[PDB]
Write an enzyme that holds these catalytic residues in place. Structure first.
Site, PDB file in Angstrom:
ATOM      1  N   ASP A 168      -2.545  35.680  -0.167  1.00 56.86           N
ATOM      2  CA  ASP A 168      -2.032  35.683   1.130  1.00 56.86           C
ATOM      3  C   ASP A 168      -1.498  34.379   1.755  1.00 56.86           C
ATOM      4  O   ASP A 168      -0.851  34.424   2.536  1.00 56.86           O
ATOM      5  CB  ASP A 168      -3.054  36.250   1.914  1.00 56.86           C
ATOM      6  CG  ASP A 168      -3.274  37.729   1.695  1.00 56.86           C
ATOM      7  OD1 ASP A 168      -2.171  38.319   1.559  1.00 56.86           O
ATOM      8  OD2 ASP A 168      -4.208  38.437   1.772  1.00 56.86           O
TER       9      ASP A 168
ATOM     10  N   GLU B 190      -2.398  42.972  13.381  1.00 60.31           N
ATOM     11  CA  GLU B 190      -1.048  43.110  13.070  1.00 60.31           C
ATOM     12  C   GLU B 190      -0.079  44.213  13.900  1.00 60.31           C
ATOM     13  O   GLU B 190       0.158  45.222  13.183  1.00 60.31           O
ATOM     14  CB  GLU B 190      -1.065  43.819  11.463  1.00 60.31           C
ATOM     15  CG  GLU B 190      -1.422  42.513  10.642  1.00 60.31           C
ATOM     16  CD  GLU B 190      -1.910  42.955   9.085  1.00 60.31           C
ATOM     17  OE1 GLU B 190      -1.873  44.269   8.703  1.00 60.31           O
ATOM     18  OE2 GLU B 190      -1.624  42.165   8.435  1.00 60.31           O
TER      19      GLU B 190
ATOM     20  N   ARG C 219      -3.755  47.775  13.991  1.00 59.60           N
ATOM     21  CA  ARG C 219      -4.617  48.017  12.791  1.00 59.60           C
ATOM     22  C   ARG C 219      -6.036  47.758  12.904  1.00 59.60           C
ATOM     23  O   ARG C 219      -6.378  46.551  13.267  1.00 59.60           O
ATOM     24  CB  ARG C 219      -4.112  47.393  11.330  1.00 59.60           C
ATOM     25  CG  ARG C 219      -5.034  47.267  10.314  1.00 59.60           C
ATOM     26  CD  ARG C 219      -4.365  46.268   9.160  1.00 59.60           C
ATOM     27  NE  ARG C 219      -5.360  45.839   8.340  1.00 59.60           N
ATOM     28  CZ  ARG C 219      -5.054  45.243   7.183  1.00 59.60           C
ATOM     29  NH1 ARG C 219      -3.660  45.044   6.720  1.00 59.60           N
ATOM     30  NH2 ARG C 219      -5.789  44.945   6.061  1.00 59.60           N
TER      31      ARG C 219
ATOM     32  N   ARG D 114      -1.991  52.644  -0.978  1.00 58.38           N
ATOM     33  CA  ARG D 114      -0.669  52.523  -0.156  1.00 58.38           C
ATOM     34  C   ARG D 114       0.467  53.033  -1.160  1.00 58.38           C
ATOM     35  O   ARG D 114       1.330  52.447  -1.611  1.00 58.38           O
ATOM     36  CB  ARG D 114      -0.514  50.988  -0.101  1.00 58.38           C
ATOM     37  CG  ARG D 114      -1.611  50.322   0.723  1.00 58.38           C
ATOM     38  CD  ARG D 114      -1.319  48.749   0.927  1.00 58.38           C
ATOM     39  NE  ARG D 114      -2.323  48.220   1.985  1.00 58.38           N
ATOM     40  CZ  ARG D 114      -2.538  46.947   2.192  1.00 58.38           C
ATOM     41  NH1 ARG D 114      -1.786  45.985   1.602  1.00 58.38           N
ATOM     42  NH2 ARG D 114      -3.159  46.564   3.132  1.00 58.38           N
TER      43      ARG D 114
ATOM     44  N   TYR E  46       3.216  48.056   3.993  1.00 60.33           N
ATOM     45  CA  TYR E  46       3.277  47.610   5.247  1.00 60.33           C
ATOM     46  C   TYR E  46       4.201  48.597   5.979  1.00 60.33           C
ATOM     47  O   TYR E  46       5.302  48.748   5.483  1.00 60.33           O
ATOM     48  CB  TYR E  46       3.331  46.084   5.501  1.00 60.33           C
ATOM     49  CG  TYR E  46       2.127  45.619   5.910  1.00 60.33           C
ATOM     50  CD1 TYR E  46       0.765  45.950   5.168  1.00 60.33           C
ATOM     51  CD2 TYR E  46       2.087  44.216   6.533  1.00 60.33           C
ATOM     52  CE1 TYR E  46      -0.310  45.278   5.202  1.00 60.33           C
ATOM     53  CE2 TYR E  46       0.868  43.435   6.441  1.00 60.33           C
ATOM     54  CZ  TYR E  46      -0.106  43.893   5.815  1.00 60.33           C
ATOM     55  OH  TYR E  46      -1.404  43.284   5.989  1.00 60.33           O
TER      56      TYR E  46
END
Ligand SMILES: *[C@@H]1O[C@H](CO)[C@@H](O[C@@H]2O[C@H](CO)[C@@H](O[C@@H]3O[C@H](CO[C@H]4O[C@H](CO)[C@@H](O)[C@H](O)[C@@H]4O)[C@@H](O)[C@H](O[C@H]4O[C@H](CO)[C@@H](O)[C@H](O)[C@@H]4O[C@H]4O[C@H](CO)[C@@H](O)[C@H](O)[C@@H]4O[C@H]4O[C@H](CO)[C@@H](O)[C@H](O)[C@@H]4O)[C@@H]3O)[C@H](O)[C@H]2NC(C)=O)[C@H](O)[C@H]1NC(C)=O
Ligand SMILES: *[C@@H]1O[C@H](CO)[C@@H](O[C@@H]2O[C@H](CO)[C@@H](O[C@@H]3O[C@H](CO[C@H]4O[C@H](CO)[C@@H](O)[C@H](O)[C@@H]4O)[C@@H](O)[C@H](O[C@H]4O[C@H](CO)[C@@H](O)[C@H](O)[C@@H]4O[C@H]4O[C@H](CO)[C@@H](O)[C@H](O)[C@@H]4O[C@H]4O[C@H](CO)[C@@H](O)[C@H](O)[C@@H]4O)[C@@H]3O)[C@H](O)[C@H]2NC(C)=O)[C@H](O)[C@H]1NC(C)=O
Ligand SMILES: *[C@@H]1O[C@H](CO)[C@@H](O[C@@H]2O[C@H](CO)[C@@H](O[C@@H]3O[C@H](CO[C@H]4O[C@H](CO)[C@@H](O)[C@H](O)[C@@H]4O)[C@@H](O)[C@H](O[C@H]4O[C@H](CO)[C@@H](O)[C@H](O)[C@@H]4O[C@H]4O[C@H](CO)[C@@H](O)[C@H](O)[C@@H]4O[C@H]4O[C@H](CO)[C@@H](O)[C@H](O)[C@@H]4O)[C@@H]3O)[C@H](O)[C@H]2NC(C)=O)[C@H](O)[C@H]1NC(C)=O
Ligand SMILES: *[C@@H]1O[C@H](CO)[C@@H](O[C@@H]2O[C@H](CO)[C@@H](O[C@@H]3O[C@H](CO[C@H]4O[C@H](CO)[C@@H](O)[C@H](O)[C@@H]4O)[C@@H](O)[C@H](O[C@H]4O[C@H](CO)[C@@H](O)[C@H](O)[C@@H]4O[C@H]4O[C@H](CO)[C@@H](O)[C@H](O)[C@@H]4O[C@H]4O[C@H](CO)[C@@H](O)[C@H](O)[C@@H]4O)[C@@H]3O)[C@H](O)[C@H]2NC(C)=O)[C@H](O)[C@H]1NC(C)=O
Ligand SMILES: *[C@@H]1O[C@H](CO)[C@@H](O[C@@H]2O[C@H](CO)[C@@H](O)[C@H](O)[C@H]2NC(C)=O)[C@H](O)[C@H]1NC(C)=O
Ligand SMILES: *[C@@H]1O[C@H](CO)[C@@H](O[C@@H]2O[C@H](CO)[C@@H](O)[C@H](O)[C@H]2NC(C)=O)[C@H](O)[C@H]1NC(C)=O
Ligand SMILES: CCC(CC)[C@H](NC(C)=O)[C@@H]1[C@H](O)[C@@H](C(=O)O)C[C@H]1NC(=N)N
Ligand SMILES: CCC(CC)[C@H](NC(C)=O)[C@@H]1[C@H](O)[C@@H](C(=O)O)C[C@H]1NC(=N)N
Ligand SMILES: CCC(CC)[C@H](NC(C)=O)[C@@H]1[C@H](O)[C@@H](C(=O)O)C[C@H]1NC(=N)N
Ligand SMILES: CCC(CC)[C@H](NC(C)=O)[C@@H]1[C@H](O)[C@@H](C(=O)O)C[C@H]1NC(=N)N
Ligand SMILES: [Ca+2]
Ligand SMILES: [Ca+2]
Ligand SMILES: [Ca+2]
Ligand SMILES: [Ca+2]
Ligand SMILES: [Ca+2]
EC number: 3.2.1.18
Lengths: 388, 388, 388, 388
Positions: free
Chosen positions: B70, B197, B212, B290, B324
């Site tokens: 990340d 976020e 979130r 996801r 996302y």
């Protein structure tokens, strides 16, 4: 547009924040990125860009072999958008040559490129993207200049050149240009004994340049120029915190008016911001090689021969390669002071990494903050093994 | 130009139409496309662009290995023309860092990038493409921000940041910027117990952010900001239609003022449009990963704890990877209302597709229509097998 | 800027001169060129550009496999500088979809893209690069449009759409847009029995469209639109010089008000300039396949059912592949008349060249001259063998 | 903008300084660089660019095979930013064809491209980037033009064309264009017996063109044009310093009004600056092949049949390949005189380097200095072995 005047002083430097980083060598492992060296940053009134000396080949290209060499007919000063890499498709050629300087005077930009064989080089001064003036070598031994931006005040943009031996006395000249034309030139004066690759900035109608004494000094020579009177002085940073490379270990007392001895005939372009207590020096961490990079706050370094650090910031770890470094500022920013900025060239390839046959670099650049920000280290990030 | 004011209400959302799609991973299999993650969309008065956090390498490059990570020194916020892919040659670096937000105030754009090690990160706020303000970490644990556009009203652009644990109480702050300077900041208030976020939009001088709760909630926290008073409130979407991921199966009654339990220490950036009966929620189709993406019309979802769907639209099938999602609107469009828009990040590579060593994504984005349009599904479209 | 009005008549066409050619397939063998099909040309007041439906992959990319398929989620209308190839780096996405039209009204451009599954497609009308209006499928069978530029007069830009079977009666509509909004729409009237992919041009406040009767006719249907009254008529080109493909051999008498029989359920987009004695028709040279391309001067072709050629020009030899063709004009040129122009799509790959797994094309385009110029032939020029 | 007028005289030429160099073949070994030949340089009021005839393929592309051929349907006049290489992504197509000229008149640019088979070629004259006038072949034998920039005065831009045999008498015409329209044309007059590829420049309302007598002369023909009267004269450079190639060794007396004999049916485009004592001639160093390049100051070369060199400058060593050369000037520069400039095409590949199957070139260009600058040599710099 009117010519820019250096009416502000430097902002208070309490730390350094990340400004730009192109990750060129990483990206260039699989994209058309030009091989470069001798990078810098320079701003126009509406944009700031990265600059460098291309080697006229991509890094993955077969012509990357032999790019450790400094002066070829295939080099050019190129500029490209801030933090993008210097690619074949986005790089704008400013002029042809293997030594350069460039600066905006508030109306348009002056770029200077030197080319030719060692005994017969010449500088071409471009203004508003057209060639205006030419200067032939005066000492027939690698006519050469800053390798970072010049600075202007009311149209007058002083530029430091050197011609002659890199390892003994040479003929350094300070040229005062306006609209690409020569108003005046003067031979170096003061106590600096040898000058190379000056890194300059301007504040309150004074231009300060921190240079490289390639002959005898491990302390750095400083030239201070008055662009209105078109006169200058020179000395050395007095501080015992020595900032050239290679260099001997730091002593407890430096030298103000002579080269600090211990290492001859070598050096690296570097810079400083000399502003009383608001003085910060950059240097490689290693005393032997172009490895690591740190900023040290050394109050009154220019004039105090016992001055030591009161604060610092690591920029590049000692286990990562560094290289040249130089100053620039966005003279067209908002606010009441000029924010000091610098770049560090992250050199990859030869001679330190000789499994590859090329030499190139990426760029990292920071600007000062009035906050006391946390630090990170900023390596080039490419894996040499991938290029094998 | 004058600062933009949020004078209009949302247009009536009867369905969603395709707005942009870059097909980045498909195209990037044989072209110089940068590896990214954390994309978003944001408009200027004369253009709308795609934004994302580059990983400082192309997807086919050998440096793509390890891009599941990340936060590295090789990341930057980049923007590029709507629906083109983020290439080395067309990507414009907005700032350097691994967490960001950006928004136009009607006069010029503010972009914020955070960088540094976990215990010493700092945000740099850029305005008119120049660094203006810096903010040091306050909780020494990954200072971080929205990962989608911020919203401005009369020059004031609120931004939500979090610093502290991602899996327990943390220190969330709402900063009110104007021309890149801090006017005010406030600690989070209200009943949201953890914020990450935030995805925001503005209408009728109110900014609504859907965030979130990475700690305990599978319902999403909502922050509503008054940019004139520079005050806010927080709660959770009351509806039983749970929109985080992973998440438990939907109940028949949700929670308005506390996290809906069942899943801890995980989540995904998401968004909603909360406008009475004109309320639409996005979510992954899968409750475990996801995968898939759908829009559900859930009248009064914010305030009705039994609210269920009255209409829907599939965006990405459950057999396709998503990621996302966030909100944006073209505040400078013609007409009497603001058209709600959103993007979905289509994540490819690790960790779900581990035959490749990289992680990247492509983008798909839609805007609302007042018609009841037919639906299609919009996958990333790349074949992993081709990259082996 | 004011809306453009069609105040001029066509210039006298005595021959055709080369206007643009991108050599896309040749160049794309070793550069990042997008796979396309359904190209066209369209001008703005200050520039003319090439347009096409991308397939969301480069030609050398592994995702080029399967690009014979017409309608995928990876297609988009893209535009790029005249005569350059459609590359990843210079292609501007106008909208997302697999059927399109686009035209400038003198103030700004309207672009329309249709997307969706066969039974649930929708058109999105963009104006000034923003989505304004949406139209859902009315017959649930591949809503579709021109595949070449539309034409505007005093802001009103008529567009022909078809929805329904491609091999029997369908529901064709003529929409009249202004600033991206629907002023009016009408069902097809007149004697044309089936309409596809109309190629249009404007002169003296009348818009003439030459279309493809995919059901029964090998003669081409013609729609003539009055953009002030917002009314139209339809018929077929009366001439026995048949211009669809495939088609039967030319007879000595054509049909004005019914499809000329002999070939069913197939065709190719094409065009004509119908201006009394100044009438020129394009067609493939082959009656069986999309091979070769020629222009024939056929005085009064629209209204004379025995009209034969009085002059001609070969554009593409019969031993070279051709494809779609359509009309466009630079409505903002200097002078007293509008110069007729056309493009020819040069299709390469499947299904005619099945040693490769892709389908793409390049573009060649010509405009009329008042001189009687020598002719050349203009093939795509790529060697299929190189892509193996 | 007003039309530019040739009001200044040439600056005094005391030496030549580097102006631009693209290193195209070097860079193109690993980047998407188009194959070209017949390059030149031309300025607009705000920018100067490189121009050339593309071959419609990259150098590394498989379609580079066979690019020794002069006239194909895949050629086009392209322009690109000064000193960058002609890439697929930065090259702007000016028009389609295999012979060209281009010049700016102070308001906008005129570009002319000729295309077609040998017996049926035609020129298309573009003005303000739109086609305006067309000229059909008059002698049905490779209608052709300058291959370097044209020159304008008060809107009138004369252009020299040739049609007919390249190895005997042919039909040369001087066309006078204004806004892309033909004002007048005249057949060649004077004593030049054959004219090809004229290289022109303007000063004090006179345009001087130095051309290539491909039939019998090794001295170069000169056409001097009065753009106000729209009349011209022709002769040969009188000097015994012969400047075509191949050519016999230099004699001690040249010929003013007839071809200097010794070599038939061959030549190379070249140029000169003829200004009394300020006269400089370019030529290949070798008398047998396109190798090396030098500038010689030959006072009164045009009119003195015994004139010999008084000064010189080597541009390209005799051990390096050269090629075409031509003149251009920045007519919009500051100052009181026009600075003479020239380019040299550095040809690589066939026929001299036949281990590769292509033919391409790079560009080097210089402008005059009033200083007496040191000289360097400027080779193409690429290694053929790398392309094998
Ligand atoms: C979060 O981020 C924040 C902000 O960045 C972090 O805080 C920073 O922490 C830094 C590291 O400790 C610190 O930097 C140091 O500052 C020192 C100055 O402060 C100290 O002295 C003053 C004056 O007395 C006090 O007021 C103050 O309170 C402190 O006590 C510098 O002295 C430090 O530099 C020296 O050390 C480093 C090694 O760490 C060398 O690389 C550097 O060159 C300096 O030392 C050499 O040079 C001196 C001068 O000649 C010699 O005396 C010395 O022996 C060394 O010489 C050898 O090495 C050199 C280099 O190789 C060689 O040439 C020579 O020949 C010899 O071999 C250093 O700059 C920041 O100021 C501090 N910032 C703030 C705002 O607090 C925080 O830690 C981060 N948090 C976490 C959790 O990580
Ligand atoms: C041409 O295109 C048009 C336009 O798109 C197409 O028409 C669309 O068709 C869609 C599909 O049928 C339709 O979408 C559905 O709308 C439902 C709402 O309408 C119905 O209810 C209202 C209210 O009573 C009525 O007025 C109305 O007439 C309808 O009867 C939604 O309820 C649908 O969503 C639910 O189903 C899907 C599965 O299809 C789930 O993915 C979705 O999450 C919803 O269900 C879950 O959630 C609810 C709420 O908690 C639970 O109660 C339920 O059990 C499900 O929960 C499980 O699943 C979730 C998700 O994995 C999980 O989290 C949970 O824990 C459980 O495991 C759906 O949105 C469009 O509205 C309709 N549009 C129009 C304008 O008509 C047309 O079909 C196309 N034509 C062709 C020929 O193809
Ligand atoms: C330098 O360049 C110049 C300029 O380009 C060159 O000059 C051009 O030369 C061209 C070729 O000769 C010429 O084009 C032809 O024009 C004909 C019309 O002129 C003749 O008739 C008129 C009217 O009587 C006279 O006034 C005139 O003086 C001439 O005599 C056309 O008729 C020609 O087209 C027909 O032939 C070609 C084959 O060459 C076909 O491809 C074309 O489709 C036409 O024929 C088909 O169609 C007709 C109509 O139905 C049928 O009757 C016929 O049987 C053919 O049908 C079969 O084929 C089609 C197509 O496959 C198929 O569908 C059908 O079913 C059947 O199987 C042709 O257009 C230019 O006009 C002329 N230009 C000028 C300004 O002069 C010069 O040659 C060049 N110089 C050199 C040295 O090269
Ligand atoms: C630092 O840089 C500076 C600046 O560049 C350097 O100084 C330059 O040095 C150059 C080289 O010496 C010099 O160039 C020469 O200039 C000569 C003219 O000057 C001399 O004559 C005049 C008139 O009397 C004097 O006033 C003056 O003081 C000098 O004495 C030219 O004549 C030279 O060209 C001829 O020689 C070269 C070979 O070197 C040929 O390539 C060239 O073509 C010329 O010779 C051919 O042509 C003539 C004319 O017909 C014939 O007579 C002769 O026999 C040759 O013919 C053969 O060759 C040709 C070509 O292949 C072929 O076609 C033919 O058939 C025959 O086979 C040359 O141009 C610069 O002027 C000088 N500049 C300045 C400002 O000083 C300095 O050296 C550099 N420093 C270092 C340390 O490197
Ligand atoms: C920098 O300083 C000079 C003054 O020394 C300013 O120059 C004057 O500018 C105004 C506006 O163009 C003119 O009216 C004067 O004639 C200028 N010349 C001089 C020498 O007086 C210049 O404007 C200043 N730059 C800025 C940005 O303010
Ligand atoms: C196209 O025709 C319309 C007239 O029908 C012109 O429109 C007028 O334009 C002028 C200038 O803006 C205005 O004063 C009138 O109000 C306009 N509207 C109408 C409907 O009258 C338009 O200018 C013409 N376009 C051009 C390029 O001349
Ligand atoms: C011989 C004099 C040197 C400076 C003191 C030398 N400068 C030039 C113009 O060649 C530099 C030095 O050799 C190299 C380095 O130290 O990194 C770069 C190199 N600089 C450049 N190639 N531009
Ligand atoms: C540790 C806190 C996380 C958010 C709750 C984390 N944010 C940052 C700044 O690292 C994100 C999370 O780990 C990743 C994901 O959930 O997809 C993206 C990752 N976000 C970014 N790399 N920008
Ligand atoms: C099924 C209806 C067809 C037109 C009569 C069909 N149109 C669409 C939108 O799919 C075209 C036809 O199948 C192809 C061709 O004939 O070349 C192109 C194809 N057109 C496009 N892919 N845009
Ligand atoms: C046959 C006439 C020739 C000029 C005297 C010929 N010109 C054209 C238009 O073909 C040139 C010549 O053959 C080549 C060369 O000498 O290098 C280039 C070639 N020029 C171009 N390809 N543009
Ligand atoms: Ca030193
Ligand atoms: Ca490549
Ligand atoms: Ca959660
Ligand atoms: Ca048909
Ligand atoms: Ca000759």
């Amino acid at each position: 547009r009117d010519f820019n005047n250096l009416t502000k002083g430097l902002c208070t430097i309490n730390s350094w924040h990340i400004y730009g980083k192109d990750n060129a060598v990483r990206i260039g492992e699989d994209s058309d990125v030009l091989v470069t060296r001798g990078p810098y940053v320079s701003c126009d009134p509406d944009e700031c860009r990265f600059y460098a000396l291309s080697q006229g080949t991509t890094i993955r290209g077969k012509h990357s072999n032999g790019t450790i060499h400094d002066r070829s007919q295939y080099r050019a000063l190129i500029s490209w958008p801030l933090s993008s890499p210097p690619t074949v498709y986005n790089s704008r050629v400013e002029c042809i040559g293997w030594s350069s300087t460039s600066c905006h005077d508030g109306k348009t930009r002056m770029s200077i490129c030197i080319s030719g064989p060692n005994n017969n080089a010449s500088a071409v001064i471009w203004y508003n993207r057209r060639p205006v003036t030419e200067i032939n070598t005066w000492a027939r031994n690698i006519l050469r200049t800053q390798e970072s931006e010049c600075v202007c005040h009311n149209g007058v943009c002083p530029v430091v050149f050197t011609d002659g031996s890199a390892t003994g006395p040479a003929e350094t000249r300070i040229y005062y240009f306006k609209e690409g034309k020569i108003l005046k030139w003067e031979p170096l004066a003061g106590t600096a004994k040898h000058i190379e690759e000056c890194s300059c900035y301007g504040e309150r109608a004074e231009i300060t340049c921190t240079c490289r004494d390639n002959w005898q000094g491990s302390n750095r020579p400083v030239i201070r120029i008055d662009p209105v009177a078109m006169t200058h002085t020179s000395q050395y940073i007095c501080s015992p915190v020595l900032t050239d490379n290679p260099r001997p270990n730091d002593p407890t007392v430096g030298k103000c008016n002579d080269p600090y001895p211990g290492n001859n005939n070598n050096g690296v372009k570097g810079f400083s911001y000399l502003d009383g207590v608001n003085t910060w020096l950059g240097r490689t961490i290693s005393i032997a090689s172009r490895s690591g990079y740190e900023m040290l706050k050394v109050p009154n370094a220019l004039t105090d021969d016992k001055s030591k650090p009161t604060q610092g910031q690591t920029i590049v770890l000692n286990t990562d390669w560094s290289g040249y470094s130089g100053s620039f500022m966005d003279y067209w920013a908002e606010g009441e002071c000029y924010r000091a900025c610098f770049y560090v060239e992250l050199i990859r390839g030869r001679p330190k990494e000789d499994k590859v046959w090329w030499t190139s670099n990426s760029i990292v650049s920071m600007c000062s903050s009035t906050e006391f920000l946390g630090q990170w280290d900023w390596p080039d990030g490419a894996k040499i093994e991938y290029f094998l």
